[PDB]
């Protein structure tokens, strides 16, 4: 199996096969630790932000990949962004401070 | 010594403590305790070892 940019899950925006065009490989906790032992921050960020969970960063990445500019303008992963709404849906006020 | 730990006295008492065990919180009734206890292991309907 191989996938570049496929379809995406609705509830949380995440890679999902809808065509039998397969959903991406699942990058788990242990793999994250494996990246953490190495000094690689950017591989990990791109792994859990732009390559997956960022509804903005993914396309903005694609355009750069084709333009010949390798970068990432990551933004915030939609999982955590949903978690904020889920927490705030209760009587719990969770805010993002400062600058 | 099992009897000395037994809170009950007569048949109705035991049936009360059984019915209130199986379906607790709700007020016990004579016909209710009898019905339940007879319905558990003694009813051709609700019980079979075959």
């Amino acid at each position: 199996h191989a996938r570049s940019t496929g379809s995406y899950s609705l509830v949380t925006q995440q890679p999902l096969g809808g065509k039998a065009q397969f959903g991406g490989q699942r990058f788990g906790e242990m793999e994250v630790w494996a990246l953490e032992a190495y000094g690689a921050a950017y591989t990990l960020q791109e792994m859990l932000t732009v390559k997956s969970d960022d509804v903005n960063g993914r396309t903005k990445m694609y355009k750069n990949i084709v333009d010949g500019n390798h970068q990432m303008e990551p933004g915030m992963p939609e999982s955590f962004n949903v978690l904020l709404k889920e927490i705030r849906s209760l009587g719990i006020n969770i805010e993002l401070e400062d600058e | 010594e099992t009897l000395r730990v037994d809170p009950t006295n007569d048949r109705l008492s035991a049936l009360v403590e059984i019915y209130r065990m199986m379906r607790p919180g709700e007020p016990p009734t004579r016909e209710a305790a009898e019905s339940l206890f007879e319905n558990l292991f003694f009813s051709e309907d609700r019980y079979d070892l075959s």
Partner: protein, 89 residues
């Protein structure tokens, strides 16, 4: 290809900062602002930057210096343009 980056790691100690510096330079080349300091073998900007670290003509100090110069190189151009903004008064 560059099989082992060890020599570059020798040139700048940290080895994480190696990734950083080589990155910054690799972008100086990839986004077209500059040109290689050493023959490109078809090596991608990734490896070209590493060769540049290995040959000791590129690191954080050198880069900061160059960029700091270019700031004044543009400040030289705009010199009349921005002073024409005396409309501030």
């Amino acid at each position: 290809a560059r099989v082992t980056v060890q020599d570059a790691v020798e040139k700048i100690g940290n080895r994480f900062d190696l990734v950083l510096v080589a990155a910054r330079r690799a972008r100086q080349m990839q986004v077209g602002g500059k040109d290689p300091l050493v023959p490109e073998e078809n090596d991608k900007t990734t490896v070209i930057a590493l060769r540049e670290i290995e040959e000791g003509l590129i690191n954080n100090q050198i880069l900061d210096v160059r960029e700091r110069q270019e700031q004044q190189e543009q400040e030289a151009a705009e010199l009349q343009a921005v002073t024409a903004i005396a409309e501030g008064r």
